[PDB]
Ligand binder design. Structure first.
Ligand SMILES: O=P(O)(O)O[C@H]1[C@H](OP(=O)(O)O)[C@@H](OP(=O)(O)O)[C@H](OP(=O)(O)O)[C@@H](OP(=O)(O)O)[C@H]1OP(=O)(O)O
Lengths: 186, 69, 266, 50, 49, 133, 51, 50, 48, 97, 48
RNA sequence: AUCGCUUCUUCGGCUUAGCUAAGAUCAAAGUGUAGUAUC
């Protein structure tokens, strides 16, 4: 009955179903049934938060944690990262971007470490750097991480171009230190 | 029966957080002792060091290949 | 006919407890579970019997079955009686499972706190905050304190505020602590709201927001009297002679004689 | 009214003040009185005694 | 009356023994009473015309 | 209080209005026919039309038009009172139709007479009504 | 935000350099900041230009 | 003049004294009009002003 | 219910101001040429 | 006004309190003549709207008869004298208003 | 039922029962506090 | 583990009998009768 209800009810009314359904499974579910209902409850509960405010970055981070621990299918996690990322801060002042920028870095870490699609992690960084308002401020983390990523691809020419346009657009101390430490290691 | 046992876990909160005696100074650390992103950075650090170890292994081949030619 | 003596007899809490003890002694696990599960079905089990049942399954190391034994106990009773089951359930879960299963652990506290009456709510809000601090994310831990001072109700909301004050200060500094002082002064009762006003004035005067400090004191002065609260007026007077001047010292003495007139109806 | 309410509040507080030793003693007094149970009867049936 | 009083003295000294320990005793009493008496308490616990 | 009556000018049928409901009745018996509802103001006018329209005006100035045959409501007009009177005075209490049945005259607590007329410009295709039994 | 940036930069430099046999040529950057801050704390509201 | 509630028999602050001198310069002698604005009434204005 | 008959919207086009008190009558002449109205100003006014 | 109150209310209510609304009506009229602003703070304001209509309606009838009697008095050559003292009272109030 | 919680009338004038209803309630009807007074700054231009 | 009478406190419900020109208007003093206290 609970499981049948979840299908035809799926968004709005399931909020009642899930609280009883999860209590039900809390006995009988114990290995497979508990974790399934709580995660799927949590999944729809984060989607409620995203429908209320897509600017709730802490809800996206907690949502992405759930799906990565699920080992959710890659295309669904990409759709959730790309939904999360589209919520660019309305203020265009760096104090508001400090939480939003890790919503891109986590995506590049997922694409590099979990999906292992390095040609798609380039596109994550290019899309990231094409969105930061560089003539007002920069995240040196982005330019550093994008530079070191191409070094892991053994492409020094790309890595130097990244750090080179970093200094050219926004000469910043964290960039110089990172670029110098790189050339010293090389 | 240890009816109190919930209290034993939260003893740190009940002892050192449940009150504050006074405040009468300020310093550069106290104005901002952790950055507003410190916990996002924390959750990345386990994954970030795998990238670091790949980078150190990668840069070792970049040097080795340069001297091979 | 259902003669009452035998018809009642199976509601036998002394005897069910004796039966359960023998099954622990001689039953082996699977029969012992059936006996306790039937004792739940009858609604004969005390909360001590649920906790005894879980400790049996825990000592066997059927830990997952212990958690549902608590869960089924929580369905059986209602507050206050559930409180010891929640205490044992939430701490027992938190120890082994509480790191990895944290996603499931947050569901337990939510499920508790939705039902929790204010006086018991204090301790459970604090263990939730401990879990979310150490394993969880920082903003969620702070949000539990914002929830805690609303839930706890008025006699001990002051304890939840002073934790929230300390923990925001410990991570985001005193400049982000300003709003929850203003909430406290507006919400906790007048004996502590005066105390919070002195606390808040100490921050603004060490940072040097002396113009804000006056409005803190002046807003506290209207629910204080110079006839018994002399320590408040002394600390404001010591502030105004230090950080003030003739044009505002006289402003202090105006509100003083105004406020005493409110009480001194004789 | 200010004199009367000050006195009445004080006497309310003073009864409330240390409302535990009296209650614990009065509970103790009641408990021991019941448990003492049978007092001696000392019956009066003097014509039986005759 | 005697049976009524045996229950009164039984619970009161149980308060005393808990109080001699120094304890929450309304919670301790809550343990045993809650199974049956919560069923009894469910029985215990403009628009005029 | 039944403050208004109207006899439908070409059926053996009449309507009467109270704050509770507007009710319809079959004559001569006086037997009951289904109610026009949701105009929960103090009503005191009814006018009924040769074409089958009834209109009910209310002390709060609101004005409902209805189809006699079905009790469907398909206009709510709120009168706005003429200068220097706005909040209380908006009310209505008279109505009559002209003898053709194509103009309505209403009398108003704002000390004005107002006259109403039927729109024509592109109406029937923009407005429709479905079935909804 | 500007204040804590400048402060943390200066203090970190102090901890790196100091504790060396030719120190004392350095004016105690963290402790002198403390000394300056406690001196500045005494301050008052000015009166009024009009009255 | 005296005995109404809300007649505000307290000390003259800064802005009330400011408003009274500002209004004495603006009005000349209008004191019954000045009295509503400062709501300290007519006698209170005049004796304070003088 | 059954099938509402469609009727055209009703639109306003007069405000005749001239009673000095509430209006509370209208009737239309048989001739349809003029209507009378009566008011809380105790006066009957005949309008065309 | 009494009929309007009873219809205004819906069912099952204190309606003997409707007699209290007529007191509020009379006070709203006296305040109008005084030119004191009548505002009862807690009033069932659909009741306020209805009272304010009937007060203004009386005020219209009361001013219009003040004009009409005075025009008669200017033409007056008749034993007006009680009507004169009435009309002087009304016109004194209308002036000061 | 609360929406029709009609406050009792307290007259400044009539009082046929002769009751004493005096200080606070009788002023609470008075309403004097609501209309604040402010003045056009033209008066400063006129004076100076 | 079920059981009864009474006292007490304590919560909600529990009515100004029109109108007008606020209807109109502002003497106090001395003589006669009734009420309270003392021999
Ligand atoms: O601008 P810099 O003097 O080179 O300071 C940088 C920079 O700080 P800014 O916010 O002032 O730019 C980094 O900040 P981001 O640009 O990356 O946002 C910051 O990184 P975090 O914000 O992650 O703290 C980093 O600090 P760290 O190297 O500890 O990450 C810090 O470098 P300094 O330690 O040299 O001040």
């Amino acid at each position: 009955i609970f499981k049948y209800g979840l299908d035809n009810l799926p968004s709005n009314r399931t909020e009642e179903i899930f609280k009883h359904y999860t209590q039900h499974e809390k006995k009988f579910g114990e290995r497979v049934g508990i974790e399934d209902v709580i995660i799927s409850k949590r999944k729809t509960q984060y989607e409620k938060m995203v429908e209320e405010n897509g600017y709730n970055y802490d809800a996206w981070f907690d949502y992405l944690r759930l799906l990565e621990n699920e080992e959710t299918d890659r295309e669904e996690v990409e759709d959730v990262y790309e939904r999360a990322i589209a919520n660019i801060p309305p203020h265009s002042e760096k104090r508001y971007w400090r939480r939003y920028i890790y919503l891109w870095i986590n995506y590049a870490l997922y694409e590099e470490l979990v999906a292992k699609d390095f040609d798609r992690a380039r596109q994550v960084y290019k899309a990231c750097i094409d969105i930061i308002p560089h003539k007002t401020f920069t995240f040196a983390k982005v330019w550093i991480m994008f530079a070191h990523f191409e070094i892991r691809q053994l492409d020094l020419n790309a890595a130097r171009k990244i750090m080179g346009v970093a200094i050219g657009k926004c000469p910043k101390d964290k960039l110089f230190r990172a670029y110098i430490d790189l050339e010293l290691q090389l | 029966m240890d009816l109190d046992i919930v209290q034993r876990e939260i003893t740190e909160h009940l002892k050192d957080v449940l009150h504050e005696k006074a405040i009468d100074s300020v310093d550069l650390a106290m104005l901002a002792p952790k950055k507003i992103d410190w916990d996002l950075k924390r959750d990345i650090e386990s994954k970030l060091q795998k990238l670091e170890r790949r980078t150190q292994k990668a840069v070792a081949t970049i040097i080795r290949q340069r001297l091979a030619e | 006919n259902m003669q009452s003596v035998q018809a009642r007899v199976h509601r036998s809490p002394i005897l069910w407890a004796m039966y359960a003890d023998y099954e622990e002694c001689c039953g082996t696990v699977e029969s012992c579970r059936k006996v306790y599960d039937k004792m739940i079905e009858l609604r004969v089990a005390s909360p001590q019997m649920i906790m005894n049942y879980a400790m049996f399954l825990e000592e066997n190391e059927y830990f997952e079955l212990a958690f549902q034994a608590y869960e089924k106990g929580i369905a059986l009773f209602k507050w206050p009686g559930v409180f010891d089951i929640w205490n044992t359930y939430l701490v027992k879960f938190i120890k082994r499972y509480g790191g990895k299963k944290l996603e499931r652990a947050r569901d337990l506290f939510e499920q508790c706190l939705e039902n929790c009456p204010p006086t018991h709510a204090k301790y459970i809000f604090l263990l939730y905050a401990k879990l979310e601090e150490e394993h969880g994310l920082a903003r969620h831990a702070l949000s539990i304190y914002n929830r805690a001072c609303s839930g706890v109700d008025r006699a001990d909301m002051h304890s939840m505020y002073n934790i929230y004050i300390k923990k925001v200060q410990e991570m985001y500094g005193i400049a982000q602590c300003r709003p929850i002082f203003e909430r406290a002064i507006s919400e906790l009762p007048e004996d502590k709201s005066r105390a919070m006003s002195l606390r808040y004035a100490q921050l603004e005067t060490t940072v040097g927001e002396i113009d804000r400090a006056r409005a803190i004191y002046a807003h506290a002065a209207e629910i204080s009297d110079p006839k018994v609260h002399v320590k408040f007026w002394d600390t404001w007077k010591n502030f105004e002679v230090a950080h003030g001047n003739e044009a505002t010292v006289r402003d202090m003495l105006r509100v003083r004689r105004s406020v005493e007139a409110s009480y001194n109806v004789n | 009214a200010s004199v009367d309410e000050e006195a009445k509040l004080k006497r309310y507080l003073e009864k409330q003040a240390r409302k535990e030793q009296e209650l614990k003693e009065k509970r103790k007094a009641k408990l021991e009185k019941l448990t003492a149970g049978p007092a001696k009867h000392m019956f009066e049936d003097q014509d039986y005694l005759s | 009356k005697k049976e009524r009083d045996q229950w009164q003295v039984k619970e009161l000294q149980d308060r005393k023994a808990a109080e001699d320990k120094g304890l929450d005793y309304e919670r301790v009493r809550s343990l045993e009473m809650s199974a049956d008496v919560t069923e009894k308490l469910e029985q215990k616990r403009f628009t005029s015309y | 209080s039944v403050r208004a009556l109207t006899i439908h000018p070409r059926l053996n049928m009449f309507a009467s209005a109270s704050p509770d409901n507007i009710k319809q009745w079959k004559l001569p018996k006086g037997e009951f026919m289904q109610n026009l509802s949701g105009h929960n103001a103090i009503i005191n006018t009814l006018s009924s039309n040769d074409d089958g329209v009834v209109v009910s005006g209310a002390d709060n100035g609101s004005l409902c038009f209805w189809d006699w045959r079905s009790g469907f409501c398909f206009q709510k007009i709120q009168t706005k009172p003429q200068p220097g009177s706005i909040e209380s005075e908006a009310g209505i209490y008279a109505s009559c139709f002209d003898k053709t049945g194509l103009r309505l005259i209403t009398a108003e607590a704002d000390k004005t007479i107002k006259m109403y007329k039927e729109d024509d410009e592109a109406t029937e295709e923009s407005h429709p009504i479905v079935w909804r039994p | 935000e500007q204040i804590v940036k400048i402060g943390h930069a200066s203090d970190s430099v102090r901890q790196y350099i100091d504790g060396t046999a030719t120190s004392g040529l350095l004016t105690d950057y963290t402790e002198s900041a403390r000394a300056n801050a406690v001196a500045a704390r005494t301050m008052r509201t000015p009166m009024l230009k009009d009255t | 003049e005296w005995l109404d509630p809300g007649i505000k028999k307290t000390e003259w602050s800064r802005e009330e004294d400011e408003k009274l001198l500002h209004l004495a310069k603006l009005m000349p002698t209008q004191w019954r009009t000045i009295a509503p604005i400062v709501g300290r009434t007519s006698a209170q204005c005049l004796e304070r002003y003088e | 219910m059954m099938k509402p008959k469609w009727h055209a919207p009703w639109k306003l086009y007069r405000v005749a101001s001239g009673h000095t008190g509430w209006v509370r009558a209208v009737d239309v002449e048989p001739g349809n040429q003029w209507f009378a109205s009566g008011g809380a100003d105790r006066i009957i006014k005949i309008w065309d | 006004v009494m009929h309007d109150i009873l219809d205004m209310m819906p069912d099952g209510i204190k309606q003997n309190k409707a007699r209290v609304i007529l007191q509020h009506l009379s006070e709203a009229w006296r305040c109008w003549k005084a030119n004191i602003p009548w505002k009862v703070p807690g009033l069932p304001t659909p009741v306020e709207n209805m009272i304010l209509r009937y007060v203004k309606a009386k005020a219209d009838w009361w001013t219009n008869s003040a004009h009409y009697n005075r025009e008669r008095v200017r033409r007056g050559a008749t034993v007006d004298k009680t009507v004169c003292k009435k009309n002087l009272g009304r016109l004194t109030r209308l002036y000061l208003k | 039922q609360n929406d029709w919680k009609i406050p009792p009338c307290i007259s400044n004038w009539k009082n046929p029962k002769g009751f004493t209803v005096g200080l606070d309630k009788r002023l609470a009807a008075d309403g004097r506090g609501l209309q604040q007074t402010h003045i056009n700054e033209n008066f400063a231009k006129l004076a100076d």
